[PDB]
mmCIF file of C-alpha atoms in Angstrom:
data_model
loop_
_atom_site.group_PDB
_atom_site.id
_atom_site.type_symbol
_atom_site.label_atom_id
_atom_site.label_comp_id
_atom_site.label_asym_id
_atom_site.label_seq_id
_atom_site.Cartn_x
_atom_site.Cartn_y
_atom_site.Cartn_z
ATOM 1 C CA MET A 1 23.371 -11.610 10.333
ATOM 2 C CA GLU A 2 25.710 -12.127 6.935
ATOM 3 C CA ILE A 3 26.068 -9.348 4.739
ATOM 4 C CA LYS A 4 25.543 -8.631 0.503
ATOM 5 C CA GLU A 5 27.574 -5.306 0.292
ATOM 6 C CA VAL A 6 24.596 -3.301 -1.187
ATOM 7 C CA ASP A 7 24.286 -0.009 -1.746
ATOM 8 C CA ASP A 8 21.644 1.073 0.903
ATOM 9 C CA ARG A 9 21.302 4.669 -0.260
ATOM 10 C CA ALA A 10 18.995 7.031 0.766
ATOM 11 C CA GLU A 11 18.250 10.114 -1.762
ATOM 12 C CA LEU A 12 16.039 13.163 -2.088
ATOM 13 C CA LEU A 13 13.999 13.202 -5.698
ATOM 14 C CA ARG A 14 14.905 14.328 -8.255
ATOM 15 C CA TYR A 15 11.792 15.607 -10.777
ATOM 16 C CA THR A 16 9.045 17.473 -8.563
ATOM 17 C CA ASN A 17 7.041 18.982 -11.225
ATOM 18 C CA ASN A 18 4.019 16.339 -11.140
ATOM 19 C CA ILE A 19 4.470 14.757 -7.294
ATOM 20 C CA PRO A 20 1.383 15.905 -5.799
ATOM 21 C CA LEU A 21 0.811 19.339 -3.178
ATOM 22 C CA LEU A 22 2.066 16.631 -0.488
ATOM 23 C CA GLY A 23 3.517 13.766 -2.004
ATOM 24 C CA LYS A 24 6.951 12.023 -0.282
ATOM 25 C CA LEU A 25 9.712 14.029 -1.931
ATOM 26 C CA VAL A 26 12.659 11.045 -0.913
ATOM 27 C CA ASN A 27 13.105 7.793 -2.452
ATOM 28 C CA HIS A 28 12.270 4.787 -1.539
ATOM 29 C CA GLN A 29 13.973 2.272 0.980
ATOM 30 C CA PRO A 30 15.845 -0.044 -1.178
ATOM 31 C CA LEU A 31 13.493 -2.591 -2.100
ATOM 32 C CA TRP A 32 14.227 -5.301 0.753
ATOM 33 C CA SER A 33 11.271 -7.953 -1.017
ATOM 34 C CA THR A 34 14.323 -8.001 -4.675
ATOM 35 C CA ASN A 35 17.472 -6.484 -2.767
ATOM 36 C CA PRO A 36 18.962 -9.208 -0.213
ATOM 37 C CA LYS A 37 20.969 -7.271 2.819
ATOM 38 C CA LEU A 38 22.595 -8.500 5.193
ATOM 39 C CA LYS A 39 20.101 -11.882 6.229
ATOM 40 C CA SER A 40 18.451 -14.464 4.080
ATOM 41 C CA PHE A 41 16.429 -16.306 6.480
ATOM 42 C CA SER A 42 13.418 -18.210 7.518
ATOM 43 C CA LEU A 43 11.666 -20.391 10.163
ATOM 44 C CA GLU A 44 11.520 -23.862 9.413
ATOM 45 C CA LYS A 45 14.751 -25.109 11.332
ATOM 46 C CA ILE A 46 12.801 -23.705 13.966
ATOM 47 C CA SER A 47 9.369 -25.379 12.662
ATOM 48 C CA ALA A 48 9.315 -27.475 15.452
ATOM 49 C CA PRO A 49 6.538 -27.671 17.740
ATOM 50 C CA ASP A 50 8.408 -26.442 20.620
ATOM 51 C CA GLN A 51 9.808 -23.008 19.109
ATOM 52 C CA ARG A 52 6.797 -22.369 17.427
ATOM 53 C CA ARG A 53 6.666 -19.588 19.926
ATOM 54 C CA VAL A 54 9.767 -18.361 19.132
ATOM 55 C CA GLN A 55 8.424 -19.014 15.596
ATOM 56 C CA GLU A 56 5.474 -16.853 17.078
ATOM 57 C CA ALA A 57 7.276 -14.246 18.458
ATOM 58 C CA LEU A 58 9.684 -13.298 14.780
ATOM 59 C CA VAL A 59 5.652 -13.095 13.313
ATOM 60 C CA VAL A 60 4.654 -10.688 15.728
ATOM 61 C CA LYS A 61 8.150 -8.753 15.274
ATOM 62 C CA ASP A 62 7.300 -8.647 11.182
ATOM 63 C CA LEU A 63 3.927 -8.236 12.041
ATOM 64 C CA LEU A 64 4.380 -4.927 13.994
ATOM 65 C CA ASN A 65 6.681 -3.685 11.443
ATOM 66 C CA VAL A 66 4.560 -4.733 8.188
ATOM 67 C CA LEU A 67 1.422 -2.361 9.816
ATOM 68 C CA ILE A 68 3.117 0.792 9.730
ATOM 69 C CA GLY A 69 3.170 0.251 5.788
ATOM 70 C CA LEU A 70 6.951 -1.128 4.938
ATOM 71 C CA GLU A 71 6.886 -4.837 4.297
ATOM 72 C CA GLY A 72 8.719 -6.961 7.186
ATOM 73 C CA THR A 73 12.182 -9.269 7.071
ATOM 74 C CA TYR A 74 9.972 -12.647 6.446
ATOM 75 C CA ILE A 75 7.948 -11.109 4.295
ATOM 76 C CA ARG A 76 8.047 -10.232 0.125
ATOM 77 C CA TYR A 77 6.297 -8.176 -1.650
ATOM 78 C CA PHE A 78 4.481 -8.758 -5.140
ATOM 79 C CA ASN A 79 6.167 -8.276 -8.245
ATOM 80 C CA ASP A 80 3.340 -5.776 -9.424
ATOM 81 C CA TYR A 81 4.054 -3.114 -6.386
ATOM 82 C CA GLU A 82 6.229 -0.575 -8.298
ATOM 83 C CA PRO A 83 7.376 1.769 -5.495
ATOM 84 C CA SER A 84 7.863 4.681 -8.622
ATOM 85 C CA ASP A 85 4.173 3.473 -9.563
ATOM 86 C CA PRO A 86 1.879 5.297 -8.007
ATOM 87 C CA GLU A 87 -0.485 3.598 -8.606
ATOM 88 C CA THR A 88 0.586 0.019 -8.962
ATOM 89 C CA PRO A 89 -1.787 -2.851 -6.395
ATOM 90 C CA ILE A 90 -0.811 -3.095 -3.476
ATOM 91 C CA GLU A 91 -0.155 -7.207 -2.544
ATOM 92 C CA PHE A 92 2.306 -9.434 -1.111
ATOM 93 C CA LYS A 93 3.280 -12.866 -0.975
ATOM 94 C CA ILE A 94 3.764 -14.439 2.733
ATOM 95 C CA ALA A 95 5.791 -17.888 2.984
ATOM 96 C CA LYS A 96 2.425 -20.486 3.753
ATOM 97 C CA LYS A 97 5.692 -22.769 4.490
ATOM 98 C CA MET A 98 5.156 -21.667 9.064
ATOM 99 C CA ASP A 99 2.484 -22.734 11.032
ATOM 100 C CA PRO A 100 -1.177 -21.257 10.020
ATOM 101 C CA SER A 101 -0.561 -19.428 13.123
ATOM 102 C CA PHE A 102 1.070 -17.412 10.920
ATOM 103 C CA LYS A 103 -0.508 -16.773 7.582
ATOM 104 C CA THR A 104 -4.152 -16.816 8.682
ATOM 105 C CA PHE A 105 -4.900 -14.279 11.269
ATOM 106 C CA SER A 106 -1.771 -12.072 9.351
ATOM 107 C CA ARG A 107 -4.646 -11.528 6.530
ATOM 108 C CA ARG A 108 -7.028 -8.684 8.509
ATOM 109 C CA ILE A 109 -2.681 -6.890 10.100
ATOM 110 C CA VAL A 110 -1.693 -7.272 6.410
ATOM 111 C CA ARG A 111 -5.490 -5.428 4.868
ATOM 112 C CA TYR A 112 -5.334 -2.821 7.384
ATOM 113 C CA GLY A 113 -1.033 -2.341 5.955
ATOM 114 C CA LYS A 114 -2.901 -2.166 2.405
ATOM 115 C CA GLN A 115 -5.308 0.132 3.261
ATOM 116 C CA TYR A 116 -3.126 2.339 5.041
ATOM 117 C CA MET A 117 -0.703 2.487 1.833
ATOM 118 C CA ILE A 118 -3.575 3.011 -0.369
ATOM 119 C CA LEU A 119 -4.738 5.970 1.970
ATOM 120 C CA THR A 120 -1.986 7.394 2.067
ATOM 121 C CA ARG A 121 -1.506 7.790 -1.395
ATOM 122 C CA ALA A 122 -4.973 9.002 -1.628
ATOM 123 C CA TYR A 123 -4.111 11.557 0.726
ATOM 124 C CA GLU A 124 -1.776 12.664 -1.739
ATOM 125 C CA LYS A 125 -3.989 11.935 -3.875
ATOM 126 C CA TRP A 126 -6.203 13.882 -3.350
ATOM 127 C CA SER A 127 -4.523 17.631 -2.589
ATOM 128 C CA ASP A 128 -4.674 18.365 -6.223
ATOM 129 C CA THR A 129 -7.511 21.218 -5.878
ATOM 130 C CA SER A 130 -8.819 20.490 -9.327
ATOM 131 C CA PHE A 131 -11.155 17.762 -7.363
ATOM 132 C CA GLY A 132 -13.176 19.908 -5.747
ATOM 133 C CA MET A 133 -12.810 21.519 -1.366
ATOM 134 C CA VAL A 134 -14.469 18.570 0.041
ATOM 135 C CA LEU A 135 -11.820 16.307 -1.775
ATOM 136 C CA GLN A 136 -8.650 18.068 0.289
ATOM 137 C CA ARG A 137 -10.564 18.031 3.097
ATOM 138 C CA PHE A 138 -11.656 15.311 3.547
ATOM 139 C CA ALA A 139 -7.800 14.973 2.854
ATOM 140 C CA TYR A 140 -6.842 16.544 6.067
ATOM 141 C CA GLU A 141 -9.831 14.471 7.910
ATOM 142 C CA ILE A 142 -8.305 10.913 6.909
ATOM 143 C CA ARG A 143 -4.279 12.496 7.526
ATOM 144 C CA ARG A 144 -5.720 14.010 11.551
ATOM 145 C CA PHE A 145 -7.824 10.136 11.579
ATOM 146 C CA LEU A 146 -3.875 8.153 10.729
ATOM 147 C CA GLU A 147 -1.902 10.187 12.934
ATOM 148 C CA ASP A 148 -4.338 11.071 15.517
ATOM 149 C CA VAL A 149 -6.221 7.762 16.048
ATOM 150 C CA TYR A 150 -4.000 5.113 14.526
ATOM 151 C CA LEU A 151 -0.800 5.826 15.192
ATOM 152 C CA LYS A 152 -1.394 7.387 18.296
ATOM 153 C CA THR A 153 -2.696 3.972 20.207
ATOM 154 C CA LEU A 154 -2.083 1.883 18.110
ATOM 155 C CA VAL A 155 1.540 1.243 17.469
ATOM 156 C CA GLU A 156 2.972 2.981 21.074
ATOM 157 C CA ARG A 157 0.550 0.757 22.793
ATOM 158 C CA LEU A 158 2.040 -2.529 20.746
ATOM 159 C CA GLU A 159 5.779 -1.349 21.391
ATOM 160 C CA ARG A 160 4.740 -1.179 24.787
ATOM 161 C CA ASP A 161 3.492 -4.097 25.626
ATOM 162 C CA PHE A 162 5.872 -6.382 22.842
ATOM 163 C CA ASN A 163 8.201 -4.846 25.016
ATOM 164 C CA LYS A 164 7.049 -4.880 28.673
ATOM 165 C CA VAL A 165 4.350 -7.458 29.053
ATOM 166 C CA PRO A 166 5.858 -10.826 28.958
ATOM 167 C CA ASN A 167 4.901 -12.856 26.432
ATOM 168 C CA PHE A 168 2.964 -10.735 24.227
ATOM 169 C CA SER A 169 -0.569 -12.831 22.130
ATOM 170 C CA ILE A 170 -1.845 -12.214 19.005
ATOM 171 C CA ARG A 171 -4.454 -13.203 20.104
ATOM 172 C CA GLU A 172 -4.826 -9.614 23.067
ATOM 173 C CA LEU A 173 -3.172 -7.946 19.950
ATOM 174 C CA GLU A 174 -6.244 -8.384 18.037
ATOM 175 C CA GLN A 175 -8.359 -8.066 20.922
ATOM 176 C CA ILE A 176 -6.681 -4.065 21.816
ATOM 177 C CA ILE A 177 -7.463 -4.034 18.412
ATOM 178 C CA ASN A 178 -11.473 -4.567 18.456
ATOM 179 C CA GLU A 179 -11.319 -3.041 21.787
ATOM 180 C CA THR A 180 -10.129 0.641 20.044
ATOM 181 C CA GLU A 181 -12.433 -0.227 17.176
ATOM 182 C CA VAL A 182 -10.054 1.537 14.541
ATOM 183 C CA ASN A 183 -10.321 -1.318 12.292
ATOM 184 C CA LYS A 184 -14.521 0.065 11.662
ATOM 185 C CA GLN A 185 -13.782 3.132 11.557
ATOM 186 C CA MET A 186 -11.145 2.458 8.842
ATOM 187 C CA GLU A 187 -13.506 0.060 7.108
ATOM 188 C CA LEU A 188 -15.656 2.592 7.061
ATOM 189 C CA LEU A 189 -12.875 5.388 5.335
ATOM 190 C CA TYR A 190 -11.850 2.131 2.533
ATOM 191 C CA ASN A 191 -15.116 1.972 1.305
ATOM 192 C CA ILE A 192 -15.808 5.774 1.309
ATOM 193 C CA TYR A 193 -13.213 5.571 -0.977
ATOM 194 C CA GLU A 194 -14.572 2.565 -2.966
ATOM 195 C CA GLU A 195 -17.385 4.818 -3.657
ATOM 196 C CA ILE A 196 -15.165 7.683 -4.694
ATOM 197 C CA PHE A 197 -13.048 6.004 -7.131
ATOM 198 C CA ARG A 198 -16.146 4.041 -8.747
ATOM 199 C CA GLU A 199 -17.618 7.392 -9.013
ATOM 200 C CA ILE A 200 -14.640 8.940 -10.996
ATOM 201 C CA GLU A 201 -14.589 5.942 -13.111
ATOM 202 C CA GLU A 202 -17.356 6.268 -14.272
ATOM 203 C CA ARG A 203 -17.252 10.022 -14.926
ATOM 204 C CA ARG A 204 -14.511 9.021 -16.874
ATOM 205 C CA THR A 205 -15.148 5.679 -18.495
ATOM 206 C CA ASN A 206 -18.546 7.991 -19.362
ATOM 207 C CA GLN A 207 -17.450 10.899 -22.303
ATOM 208 C CA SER A 208 -20.422 10.417 -24.445
ATOM 209 C CA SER A 209 -40.050 31.298 -17.086
ATOM 210 C CA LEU A 210 -43.925 29.194 -17.911
ATOM 211 C CA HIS A 211 -45.168 29.428 -14.575
ATOM 212 C CA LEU A 212 -42.453 31.018 -11.522
ATOM 213 C CA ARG A 213 -41.379 33.628 -14.319
ATOM 214 C CA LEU A 214 -37.710 33.084 -13.783
ATOM 215 C CA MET A 215 -35.177 34.352 -16.531
ATOM 216 C CA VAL A 216 -32.737 31.299 -15.898
ATOM 217 C CA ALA A 217 -31.650 28.056 -18.321
ATOM 218 C CA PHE A 218 -30.174 24.350 -17.521
ATOM 219 C CA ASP A 219 -27.004 23.893 -18.201
ATOM 220 C CA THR A 220 -25.960 20.372 -17.027
ATOM 221 C CA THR A 221 -23.132 20.159 -17.117
ATOM 222 C CA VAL A 222 -21.135 17.451 -15.933
ATOM 223 C CA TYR A 223 -17.604 17.456 -14.352
ATOM 224 C CA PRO A 224 -14.546 14.338 -14.774
ATOM 225 C CA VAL A 225 -14.223 14.900 -10.615
ATOM 226 C CA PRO A 226 -17.414 14.578 -7.914
ATOM 227 C CA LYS A 227 -17.571 17.616 -5.986
ATOM 228 C CA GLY A 228 -19.181 18.732 -2.794
ATOM 229 C CA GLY A 229 -22.895 17.783 -4.081
ATOM 230 C CA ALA A 230 -22.607 14.154 -5.282
ATOM 231 C CA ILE A 231 -19.663 13.766 -1.686
ATOM 232 C CA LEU A 232 -22.610 15.171 0.652
ATOM 233 C CA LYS A 233 -24.999 12.588 -1.613
ATOM 234 C CA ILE A 234 -22.545 9.630 -0.974
ATOM 235 C CA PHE A 235 -22.299 10.395 2.874
ATOM 236 C CA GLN A 236 -25.691 10.746 3.509
ATOM 237 C CA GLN A 237 -26.477 7.484 1.344
ATOM 238 C CA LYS A 238 -23.537 5.613 3.629
ATOM 239 C CA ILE A 239 -25.457 6.654 6.457
ATOM 240 C CA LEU A 240 -29.045 5.671 5.502
ATOM 241 C CA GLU A 241 -27.863 2.558 4.346
ATOM 242 C CA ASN A 242 -25.540 2.304 7.819
ATOM 243 C CA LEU A 243 -28.017 3.408 10.056
ATOM 244 C CA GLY A 244 -28.419 1.263 13.824
ATOM 245 C CA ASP A 245 -24.513 0.772 14.475
ATOM 246 C CA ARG A 246 -24.174 4.551 16.827
ATOM 247 C CA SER A 247 -20.428 4.716 17.216
ATOM 248 C CA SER A 248 -20.478 4.512 12.973
ATOM 249 C CA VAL A 249 -22.711 6.764 12.789
ATOM 250 C CA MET A 250 -21.057 8.843 15.269
ATOM 251 C CA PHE A 251 -18.328 9.193 13.305
ATOM 252 C CA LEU A 252 -20.200 10.406 10.562
ATOM 253 C CA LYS A 253 -22.214 13.251 12.489
ATOM 254 C CA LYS A 254 -18.335 14.489 13.426
ATOM 255 C CA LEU A 255 -17.314 13.698 9.633
ATOM 256 C CA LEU A 256 -19.971 15.703 8.259
ATOM 257 C CA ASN A 257 -19.566 18.625 10.752
ATOM 258 C CA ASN A 258 -15.893 18.977 9.722
ATOM 259 C CA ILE A 259 -15.665 18.606 5.896
ATOM 260 C CA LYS B 1 -36.150 26.560 -23.174
ATOM 261 C CA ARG B 2 -36.254 23.843 -22.068
ATOM 262 C CA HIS B 3 -32.655 22.328 -22.696
ATOM 263 C CA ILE B 4 -29.912 19.488 -22.062
ATOM 264 C CA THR B 5 -26.540 20.037 -22.132
ATOM 265 C CA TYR B 6 -22.898 18.523 -21.748
ATOM 266 C CA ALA B 7 -19.480 19.853 -20.179
ATOM 267 C CA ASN B 8 -16.183 19.568 -21.562
ATOM 268 C CA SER B 9 -14.653 21.810 -19.641
ATOM 269 C CA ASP B 10 -12.717 21.547 -15.725
ATOM 270 C CA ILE B 11 -10.853 23.647 -13.279
ATOM 271 C CA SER B 12 -7.252 23.600 -13.769
ATOM 272 C CA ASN B 13 -4.859 25.595 -10.828
ATOM 273 C CA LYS B 14 -1.717 25.779 -11.766
ATOM 274 C CA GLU B 15 0.494 25.888 -8.434
ATOM 275 C CA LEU B 16 -0.652 22.232 -8.733
ATOM 276 C CA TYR B 17 -1.712 21.238 -11.830
ATOM 277 C CA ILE B 18 0.823 18.987 -14.139
ATOM 278 C CA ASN B 19 3.051 20.924 -16.690
ATOM 279 C CA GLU B 20 4.196 18.014 -18.545
ATOM 280 C CA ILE B 21 3.470 14.628 -19.226
ATOM 281 C CA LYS B 22 7.173 13.353 -20.162
ATOM 282 C CA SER B 23 7.547 12.757 -15.780
ATOM 283 C CA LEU B 24 5.943 9.603 -16.549
ATOM 284 C CA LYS B 25 9.158 8.364 -18.942
ATOM 285 C CA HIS B 26 11.104 9.648 -16.210
ATOM 286 C CA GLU B 27 9.847 7.494 -13.641
ATOM 287 C CA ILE B 28 9.695 4.483 -17.079
ATOM 288 C CA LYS B 29 13.396 5.648 -16.273
ATOM 289 C CA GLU B 30 13.719 5.248 -12.863
ATOM 290 C CA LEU B 31 11.713 1.667 -12.946
ATOM 291 C CA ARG B 32 14.287 0.648 -15.351
ATOM 292 C CA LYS B 33 17.205 1.464 -13.169
ATOM 293 C CA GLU B 34 14.673 -0.344 -10.226
ATOM 294 C CA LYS B 35 14.777 -3.583 -12.606
ATOM 295 C CA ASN B 36 18.521 -3.926 -13.436
ATOM 296 C CA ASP B 37 19.133 -3.403 -9.201
ATOM 297 C CA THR B 38 16.251 -6.715 -9.799
ATOM 298 C CA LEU B 39 18.747 -8.467 -12.120
ATOM 299 C CA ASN B 40 21.431 -7.479 -10.223
ATOM 300 C CA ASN B 41 19.726 -8.856 -6.929
ATOM 301 C CA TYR B 42 18.563 -12.164 -8.377
ATOM 302 C CA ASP B 43 21.512 -12.916 -9.794
ATOM 303 C CA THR B 44 23.626 -12.342 -5.743
ATOM 304 C CA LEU B 45 20.988 -15.010 -5.038
ATOM 305 C CA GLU B 46 21.967 -17.163 -7.540
ATOM 306 C CA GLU B 47 25.606 -16.598 -6.043
ATOM 307 C CA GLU B 48 24.389 -17.349 -1.951
ATOM 308 C CA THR B 49 22.304 -20.219 -3.289
ATOM 309 C CA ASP B 50 25.115 -21.825 -4.928
ATOM 310 C CA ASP B 51 27.759 -20.991 -2.566
ATOM 311 C CA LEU B 52 24.753 -22.799 0.903
ATOM 312 C CA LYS B 53 24.260 -25.579 -1.758
ATOM 313 C CA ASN B 54 27.915 -26.268 -1.659
ATOM 314 C CA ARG B 55 28.318 -25.679 2.263
ATOM 315 C CA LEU B 56 25.460 -28.085 2.218
ATOM 316 C CA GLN B 57 26.965 -31.099 -0.246
ATOM 317 C CA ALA B 58 30.149 -30.164 2.351
ATOM 318 C CA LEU B 59 28.393 -31.078 5.333
ATOM 319 C CA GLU B 60 26.163 -33.871 4.410
ATOM 320 C CA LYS B 61 29.849 -35.103 2.721
ATOM 321 C CA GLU B 62 32.082 -34.641 6.134
ATOM 322 C CA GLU C 1 3.113 6.554 -29.855
ATOM 323 C CA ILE C 2 3.894 7.175 -25.671
ATOM 324 C CA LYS C 3 0.802 5.003 -25.257
ATOM 325 C CA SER C 4 2.744 2.151 -26.880
ATOM 326 C CA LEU C 5 5.121 3.115 -25.363
ATOM 327 C CA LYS C 6 4.065 2.854 -21.972
ATOM 328 C CA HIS C 7 2.514 -0.980 -23.183
ATOM 329 C CA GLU C 8 5.872 -1.639 -24.007
ATOM 330 C CA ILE C 9 6.707 -0.592 -20.030
ATOM 331 C CA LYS C 10 4.173 -2.134 -18.764
ATOM 332 C CA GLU C 11 5.695 -5.494 -20.578
ATOM 333 C CA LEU C 12 8.574 -4.994 -19.526
ATOM 334 C CA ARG C 13 7.420 -4.763 -15.896
ATOM 335 C CA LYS C 14 5.086 -8.165 -16.252
ATOM 336 C CA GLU C 15 8.799 -9.719 -17.537
ATOM 337 C CA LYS C 16 10.216 -8.689 -14.294
ATOM 338 C CA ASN C 17 7.646 -9.909 -11.704
ATOM 339 C CA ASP C 18 8.141 -12.959 -13.608
ATOM 340 C CA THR C 19 11.688 -13.266 -13.055
ATOM 341 C CA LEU C 20 11.241 -11.589 -10.034
ATOM 342 C CA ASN C 21 8.512 -14.560 -9.076
ATOM 343 C CA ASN C 22 11.779 -17.126 -9.942
ATOM 344 C CA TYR C 23 13.865 -14.723 -7.665
ATOM 345 C CA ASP C 24 10.881 -15.371 -4.907
ATOM 346 C CA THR C 25 10.829 -18.959 -5.475
ATOM 347 C CA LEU C 26 14.755 -19.474 -5.467
ATOM 348 C CA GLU C 27 14.660 -17.258 -2.105
ATOM 349 C CA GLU C 28 12.147 -19.607 -0.411
ATOM 350 C CA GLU C 29 14.807 -22.435 -1.836
ATOM 351 C CA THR C 30 17.918 -20.988 -0.481
ATOM 352 C CA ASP C 31 15.465 -20.157 3.442
ATOM 353 C CA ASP C 32 15.352 -24.271 3.041
ATOM 354 C CA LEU C 33 18.778 -25.018 2.096
ATOM 355 C CA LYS C 34 19.896 -22.667 4.893
ATOM 356 C CA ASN C 35 17.433 -24.438 7.251
ATOM 357 C CA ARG C 36 18.586 -27.741 6.239
ATOM 358 C CA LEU C 37 22.687 -27.028 6.809
ATOM 359 C CA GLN C 38 21.135 -24.660 9.848
ATOM 360 C CA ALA C 39 19.777 -27.837 11.812
ATOM 361 C CA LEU C 40 22.244 -30.343 10.711
ATOM 362 C CA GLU C 41 24.604 -28.233 11.640
ATOM 363 C CA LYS C 42 22.987 -27.835 15.303
#
């Protein structure tokens, strides 16, 4: 409603010698979390028990905005987040003054958004061919999972519901989310990426003929990044640990057949 | 013939391998511009709360 | 010297974290007073 007279501008990135093969080349949006523009508003005036419906409607709007990886209106990024920093952590503060309906259930959706952002960053980072071919193939797999399972169903269905269905509820939102079961596959991929990061961190911190007649000698060589054999062993260990869930095991079979 | 070694080599592909490390200082300068912007926004928010607090006192006195 | 420069830049980032946490508290304060005056005028 108001105006801040802030120069909202978007520009292409000048430096390109250390942006990965699939990283974006545009500057970040003008940091609403710190740069105010046209509004600095809260729902305490409509925090009355009766205006809870309008409050939760605006909350629904904001949670629809935040799930795409871009922060909403009444949500502020935590200061550790730096757009130009590609290794900065993902965290943000939400106003606890509103009804617990705003903060309790939204933790799952904001964790989904955080893991979506970190998975996009992992896709951009794993574009480096020095990480082996299996990792950049898993990158294409996670891109397909994001742009053909997450975006095609979730955001489109949610927008259609918020535009047509009268008074859509966050309960029905969570219901259709768990009915699409994208959260389980997303958590599996997140755990896979966590194990990959663990192996990379270990390899980075740890820097220090008799019978069969074969003219072969051992060359025990370890690289700073895992390779195809390590990734296959990791996937086998994961499927062995997650034996029992039919959807999980069939998804893992498809992923192993594809990579 | 039985031996154990250790590797000190890795693959590098010129099309996407890093050419120089000064881009980290370049993005540091970008973050410095970001910090200046954040300070300016803090100033503007202080101005806004001052004006709106004055409006609050005026309406409470009226 | 590059590592020391990066450490100083991270220290400046943390200083900005503190001042922007102050910014967030001041923002919720603006929110409080805004909704207060809006409820009084409404």
